[model samples]
Target chain A: VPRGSHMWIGVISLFPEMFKAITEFGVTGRAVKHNLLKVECWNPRDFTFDKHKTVDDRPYGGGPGMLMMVQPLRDAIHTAKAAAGEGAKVIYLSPQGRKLDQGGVTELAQNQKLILVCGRYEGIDERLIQTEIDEEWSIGDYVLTGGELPAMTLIDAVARFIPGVLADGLLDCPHYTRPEVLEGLTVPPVLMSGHHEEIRKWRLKQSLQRTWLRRPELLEGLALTDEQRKLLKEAQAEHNS
Target chain B: VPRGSHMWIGVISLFPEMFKAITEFGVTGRAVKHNLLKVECWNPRDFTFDKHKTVDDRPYGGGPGMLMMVQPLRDAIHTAKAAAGEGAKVIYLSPQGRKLDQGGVTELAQNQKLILVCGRYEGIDERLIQTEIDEEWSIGDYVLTGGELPAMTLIDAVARFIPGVLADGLLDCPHYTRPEVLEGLTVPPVLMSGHHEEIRKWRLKQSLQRTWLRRPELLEGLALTDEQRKLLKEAQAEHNS
Candidate 1:
């Protein structure tokens, strides 16, 4: 395990093989191949001792779905933690957890190590989570059948913050490429002007306007500059007209 | 080609194989195998006609990143849609789109067919999105390098409301399974009381209290009944005192 700033992630899951979705795709895959990041998965069944290597049982309170039994999950988590060494924080993917966002991802990517626990069935027994998990995170307000997809989403989001893994800037202005006129649509004139300052200003205004038009809630939290205020006013007038 | 309420989905992605994360695992996998749901993927790269089969180019207006070219993506989207037949809603998974929730998933699940578009690099050309996409949806506020993870997440959420795919109750009461006592943690006594009505009341209170504690915003939008109000008050006293 390489030290300092390189993210070493240990995934404790029942469907460990499913993580190849992240470990083997696009930019995230490239980063993995180059050792820019490291991931290892531990299956809870590996820690089970029974002949069936059983991992789930019906809930005590008479629920329709089964809950992941306690022992196997607890043992797998401990094993992953031990393998990850010190300074590893255990995170459980659950609907009841803190909702994930870009700011949270920036902080999480810098951490020394992470042990992500993915629960199957209804969810892991509440006692295992209460005792062994350090944090719980939710990708959104929707309910998924299991934690695997949420875990993969978290990894993809976290990977972007790692240096050279991905590139991001604002909500993004619209981008157009070759064949300037396609389906009778022409490129914006300012883009081809070659006047750098004007191009920068136009792009910034476009991004601001797009965000205002689409996700106005995101802008409510920001402290806008005087120039931004003016640009938004102009964009608002254009939008209304 | 299955008719009625069965969901038939077409995904347009560069990394088409990555979808196996859902197509081959757990409940979603089982659902796919049994024909309760149908999914097919069309790679945008496959639609390219160039020697290199290029699908992306640098932005106009001199940006730092590349944008997906219009032709390849548009062709792939059209193909997926035609294959899915009519009443197919083409959804682009982006950070700027509508925030997904369980209610949205419920509405989306009932739809006859869906075409999910996954964008890579910076994003796809604005013109293609304007003309081709019927709707835009976002999993959360977080940013990732690509939309594949979000698309998979949408599928997982949508699958839950299907006739026989897993189940859901609420934010969910704490579920305990085998080994009633683990590391000094005991199962709640009310679960073992064999008093059905009292047990029902306990579970509801727990669900309400858990939602109120963790996601108070959800409770704000709800109009609670007198019994619900009483249970919440009782829960508040127990929690605060």
Candidate 2:
């Protein structure tokens, strides 16, 4: 295990194999290999008592799709909670929750464990979410058929914050190589200067500019100091140029 | 095989396991098991001649992130195409492409194969996409770290249109069930009626109403017939009552 930091990701889903994909490589795999992170998988079917091992049913009253039964999922969450220890916050992935962003990732990284429930089959019984889940998170405003992908996205993004799994303090630098120019796309001149301070300034500016163009909404409510404002203005100017 | 339709999904990615989450799922799982669809996984490393098998490099000029290589991905696409058949079209998941919607799903269902190159990191080399890809698709305007989930989404949405998978010719109905009322949310009254024709009329109206509320942009290009409009208008009056 890596020293000074610990993280556990507990995944609850009907499909255990879905979580296995996260354990295979890149940041997620590295986190496990180095022991900086812990991953646990549970299936609601294992928690069910019936002969059918039923985890879903026709919704009460009437609906076109099946509703996930509460008991099995609730039981699974209980088991995961027991294994995860104290300070573990359970989050159910739902369209109704606040969308995740960089700050959310930072906040979540401080937690010792995150119990993530992957909802499926139209939607999970609302009671399970209301009673057991501490928070709900949407991968986006649009609904997906299920929540497994959002869980994975959450895992990978959060894992990047864990120390040492990524190169120590070296955020993957923006690098443009070869031809210096291609199809009218040109690398910023500061990158070629090989001056460390100038390069750092260039990157901060670029990051803000790119984020503004791509996801202006994420910038809402964030408090920016004067230095940040100056750098962001430079980025915007560079982008326009 | 379920009569005469075949839709093949080919994924080109460094992480082959990433695609498994969808291919093994409710819609995709059912589709593949019933032989209505096929999934092909390809890794660019498999095509590389280099001893280290490096498939990524610094981008041209300067940037903060690594750019995935072009040639290996191109070779992988060639392999997927050969496997798909003589006249396969390649679709790439890109941030720049037009967004996906219900109509796109309807159109793609008719094709025998869809080759999806799921890019990673900063994205695939633009050159490869320009040279080899037939079309580009985006799940939405926003960014996710990778294309795996989007690939799954495409697979699930498109697979639903293949006939016979869903019995009763039912496209998923607008569903609300239980408690008839809860936490300020109530099931629509038409759902409770045993009258099949009225129920159908209510559902048609609700689906349009729900879509308008949640995803109004989707209805923009939709071709709503006069008959369907009449049903909707009547349903709205009924809802008011």
Candidate 3:
């Protein structure tokens, strides 16, 4: 079902080696194998007109480290954008971007193409972000030395929501077995309950509860039913209690 | 300054190869070198009681895939906990945990020890998180195939906040460059003014203004002075206009 909309990820970074761990593994690898996703690489160094292919310069106000130059990153972004179709969105991953959430992933997953620009050094020039970038996504509110890991994070997250990417059988709850049965903690007995309706209700209830307790903000943007809201409230109270 | 409170990270997973990428370079590597952080690994297969050391079983409620069983993972967590010393926090990185943010990293960085539990398959027994795990920090509101990358993301984010980890004299403002005599968009003249106090105020105001425009959520918990808030409000109003 997801085959029609191509999930093309274009990563522009100097440290492509950092992505090998992501590209070769588990969901990302499997998704690529099934033709659900495609990732292409672009290095700003390749686009640099300078003989040295230099990408950074001393901060104008006088700082220790070099700031990434605007022109090279801007050129690389335009190059990726031209290659990708009109549906593509150029996202710059930085500490300054929106703190990405499941809702953001769902939004990006629906798009046929994404061009992820990973900035490095002090950070790319604001000119690049303001002029060339469409959106900015940050993995967390904290800072990273570079955007490599956050870029991989963006791919891993957005890829999962794609239809047919996850095996249908692997989709539900009650599929957990902890090692502490003797400690009096076990999978909820209701999960093992023979009543199918009770089991479904419980599963839905748990998902609602889990999201509320862990991610209350996620619920805010979601259009939830009255029953779901009540369930989440109960879950939140239970968590607090 | 960060060297005195060194933290050790113990990871328990089937795929030890996951650590290869983490140990390679950037933040995690630097943490290890500076004695700010170290990683210990445990493989469940090594503790298997059965001949083949099978670590998973069919879910009790009837699921498509196998769920990780109690014994192997329990042994791994227990053994790592033992070696972790008293007062160490055992964190199972899972989606069900508190959504990790800058605040969470600040909390974790202050700690002297960490035992990160990474689980694959259906999921770790929910019992494990409640019983032995002190905290669960989700990298984001989305799920990844495994906890390895999330663990990487966590360590990297938390590590940088550790004092002396980041290179000194390298703080970058929202925009840093010579105030060129450009036609359409020019840098605020205050950036080029030789007054140090004025430059500092300008940098803070720009950072605040940029963050408010891009990620207003980051400002929610931020403690701002009256002047800064007024400036931000004005900047926000200007953007709306």
Candidate 4:
């Protein structure tokens, strides 16, 4: 896992402190613990000059809320780009960007150099997006106040793609622990046979069944084999009994 | 803004340290600063009685990944329940949970007491999910290694729905900063209309148009007034000058 190259990402935000949550903690921590991932933060506020050291100002038009000023953010973006590789991409995290899913994460995980820009939703000038940003991405359909969480969300999702990051049990279903019997619930005895191939097949069928029962839409994306079809309850129902 | 009662949440996870990112900084922090939010963390491992303070074990069946065992997580939930109000709701954050959206955030925001459980991909016993959990929630369609970020995400979204948290500017699109012109880009001429009455009308039209073009399906759920129907460009297409 620790053998070679890693993803290098630079994040520009008002709250650079917030990123410490993922960059330094939990499982993602192990990602960096190995040579696979490295994250660095740059603050937009640091690029400002003035008594207020302003990163935002009132909008040109009549409006109640303020707008993220251009210069400070513009300069910050330039600096982050300078820090990353020449081929590094600049992405702004906003609701308007492409909705992120596992596919998006997989695509991004391939990039070795990247820069993420987080703006407060007082909102920023479209000029910044049009001129400096290469892409924009959203975490979900809902909106949050700013981009920090979405940035963190993006980081976590991409981190999973790194080698040796995380792997779920069996077909990604509920796992059992030491106690064969808990309260009255017992581990399904088939697990005890220790026959390697049987458990692997058993795991997939259960995983398939659970997903089929829980999220059938996922099955539409998968190309199921004939054996997989037979293994599904659609046919396995009478056979197992 | 700090007038009255706030929300209370209990988070159960291995990385209680991860929560400081929200409970201390950013917009969600303001929710707590104003007495509108109070969050407490309870680690499942703390409740373990064994030599290793273990919170997980192997399934009764042979499997590669470990299963989140019952007792520690169960006791953690029980302890969280004891700390919260009598009516506190228990929620486990997992891919299997109800998909979280703004509407879901709205419903949960109304609740004053909540408990969110984060499970690893190692997975948890179904027995605990069946016997202890009340609601299951998912942040998005993608898969991540753990529940901590999802828990944090849920907190941020619910915090936005809290009384005095955050408010975006204009029509929820890009906003501009003071200097009307940037490089070659200029503020939209309509926004600068000196008349307040006209500017208000202008924004309503932009807001309507934005929802129409960006996410039309969202418009389907909204009931339109006769005036809004007019404000919407749907009917005015060729009829207008």
Candidate 5:
């Protein structure tokens, strides 16, 4: 369904319909409509041969939750892989995988194809993962009931890196509109001044300050310029006071 | 929509329909049907008084993406909070927040009411978050197009800790089902054996080995018992060999 260098995402799941939550939403929906990206779902149930088309069963060892049966999942993955064609990276969404980050999403968006295997129940057989999957990624440390949400998260984040999905290269900054004063809180003075250089500096300072105050860990990998460092110091003093 | 001590979740979002991805699927669907959990959405658009009913606008200092307008978001969050009642904890899902983990999910699940504010575009105004929100949480390090996916993830993981949401009281372990041998891979022999103690020990070893190999950071806070420590050591020897 995709051509050229556009990102093609193939999802393997028991609940293929769940993907519409993304495929029908704001930016992602528009991307799909314009062929900036393509998304397809391959359901494990469709790959099963039995009347019940069972996709899960009791664990080999005694456990409370059922484990997803390996055969159907394996077959579904094979079909999705074929649909994605060569050079497709197969990723499994799981709590045990490496933590996902903004940098990872940016890197992954460059790939031509991504086959996301979304495991449900306890999880698909580990051997299937060992033999068929290329990588495993976790959205965070928390355990989710399934991989569908994480898959959608991956698609949404990765799509933003595509050339046409977003209008520009700059990250977001604070915004304000008409009714400049609301509940007695006025819009920031520098923003309304219309001096381009000062506005740019203020926006950069706020972004750096917000990130530094809320997620200091993100700054560890960043190589900050002298100006940014000075801005951060100013923000720190202001916040501390 | 809720009665008793069941978990009540009120969501504030522009894309309220995206929530069906959770309310209509798998375990979460069952939980809602059985009244174990109640999820309701309040749209920011519903609170807008303008003819166009706009929910976002250009940045204050000038930037790429629009920020969610403050008035509608603030009104919607207030309505959600009122619906959730006095003890509700208002949480905003954002990239600039504390990272989520299993411990966080376990703690959040204990709450009887949770009001989740989902931001879109650049984000809601800083003053609104300062005045109305109680806590902020991030699913991971990646930036997403919106907060809907993270909210769904939070619901799924938090639901697991609710008393009856899961049928039993144990975390997931590796699972294997019938056709014990497939693609030349046999289910581990210990699983088929009738010895309960041996099966217990083997399962524990595999869990420890898997976690230690894939997510070593998790072990930092774990207080392993003598038998578990011995099992982990044995697992290490087997894996290394």
Candidate 6:
């Protein structure tokens, strides 16, 4: 068993090497190195029976890009699901899926296993998605060449919620370093004041202010505490001034 | 001069190898191979003067994670900007930035030069961001271990809009192949019907229906044609039935 129990991930893709980005870098790498998580890759090309080892073909109605052939992809997914175990949820990463967010990442982390399918070209055959996939997830409103990067993003985000993987919470506030002041911008005074309560309040206010400014839609869904509301009001007033 | 003019990108990052995902993968790779795009890497570590080549230090307020020091990053970005040339927009990938979308990707594709900054650790010092970054962008609401995946996503999305990079339009419709039937799911008959106009209408209707079912918000921005309105109503009736 891995460090955090059976939080296994099985990735189905044509280019498994692309996953090296997460498998060898930063937090996800450290998690894999320490055996806190286990990730296995399954390539659809490996499952192809043809001499050419083909995985894609022209669309039926004659569109621009090819569609991934259903047989090879289905076979690959079956192998991945078997390895991932009985309860593993098969998620297909695509533009036409539910938008992923922090809450979704938190919920996905609770699963014991996840079989992520990364589509290339146009996309996988719709029949394969209908028969084998449990859900579809999209990283954002933009379109991508393939699903690999989004899968890596999902893995990294979900890994943070795994026990022992992260030192603190998923959301990190702004940070500053030794120079004290750099190019006229000084580190916030409250950070250097060394007062615990004041520092906590200051950090919270900054987090709220940053979120409010950058992602106001996020704030609408959250219930702000009285202190937080007061802090946000102060932040708004300061911004206007 | 590269194919289709001066489309160039300079990336500033600690882990430049992570970019191999886009540089070696399908469409983006093809774009680079065809000289439709050019990408250069600038490592912050390369700019460090310290014996340890250290780029990060403890946060001023004592956070669990370290903050990326400003000097190395700023210098690296400066070099990248010089390489990318004038009219280059320096975009920093961060969760605190504006959310990226299809329209944003389309807009970014029009640029002649782009410098992308990928941050790791807690985040880069705020001073560097304030001074150097032209804009900041977030892929989605979820946070990842670093900015590499988000950067790759942006590159792939933007590359699709570049001329000759994609054979067809940026967005692709659902597709099917040789096996007309698979596991009781038959290919939609309209695709097989040889009537060009009917096929076009069918594909559009399916696209509209799928988008309506999965992402209702996307339709809010679209001004539907009379035919599209009729099809969507039919699709809704069919869905309800």
DockQ of each: 0.78, 0.21, 0.44, 0.58, 0.59, 0.71
Model 6 CA lDDT for position B215: 70
Model 1 chain A lowest lDDT segment of ten? A163-172
TM-score of chain B, candidate 5? 0.93
Q: Write the per-residue lDDT of candidate 2 for residues B1-241, one digit (tens) a residue.
A: 5646767788888888777777677666777888887788999989888899988877654555677776677789888888888767788886556566556767777787888888777777655665678987766444555677667767766777777554111123444444466456565665576667777666666566655555455567567778567865665677689
A1-241 per-residue lDDT for model 5 (tens digits): 4335678999999998899888888888888988988899999899889999999977776756788887888888999988778999999998777778877887888898999999888888877877898998888777788899989989999998888886111233455764577667788999889898999888788788877766676678688889888988998999999
Per-model TM-score versus the true fold:
0.95, 0.72, 0.84, 0.89, 0.92, 0.94
**lDDT of every model, 2 decimals:** 0.85, 0.70, 0.72, 0.77, 0.82, 0.83
Backbone clash total for model 2 is: 10
In order of listing, the candidates' clash counts read 0, 10, 1, 1, 1, 0
Report how far residue B66 has shifted in candidate 4, in Å: 2.6
Candidate 2's displacement at residue A211, Å, is 6.8
lDDT by residue (tens digit), candidate 5, B1-241: 3335579999998888898888889988888888988899999999999999999977676667788877788889888887778999999898767788877888898898898888888777866766798998888777888888888889888988877776111123466777788778898888888678999888788778878887676676688889889998998999899
lDDT of 1 by residue, B106-143 (tens): 88988878999999988887777788888889999888
Model 5, residue B124: displacement in angstroms? 0.8
- Enumerate residue pairs that collide in model 1: none
DockQ of 4: 0.58
After superposition, candidate 4 runs with Cα above 4 Å error:
A1-3, A167-171, A233-241, B1-3, B167-171, B197-241
State residue B174's C-alpha deviation in candidate 5, in Å.
3.8
What candidate 6 gets wrong by more than 4 Å, as runs, is: A167-173, B167-173
Best by TM-score: 1
Error of 3 at B124 (Å): 1.0
Off by over 4 Å in 3: A1-4, A46-54, A167-175, A178-180, A208-241, B1-3, B33-35, B49-53, B167-173, B177-188, B217-220, B233-241
- Candidate 3 per-residue lDDT over residues A1-241, each given as its tens digit: 3586658988898766677766666667778877888888888788788789987766655556667766676677778888996888888887766768766777878788889988766787666667678997888766777788889888888777777666111122434554326487666777667677777667777777655555566667678778766766776788789
Docking class of 2: incorrect
Residues A102-189, candidate 2: write the lDDT tens digits: 5677787788789999977887766566568899776544456678877887877677777865611112224455546656656567
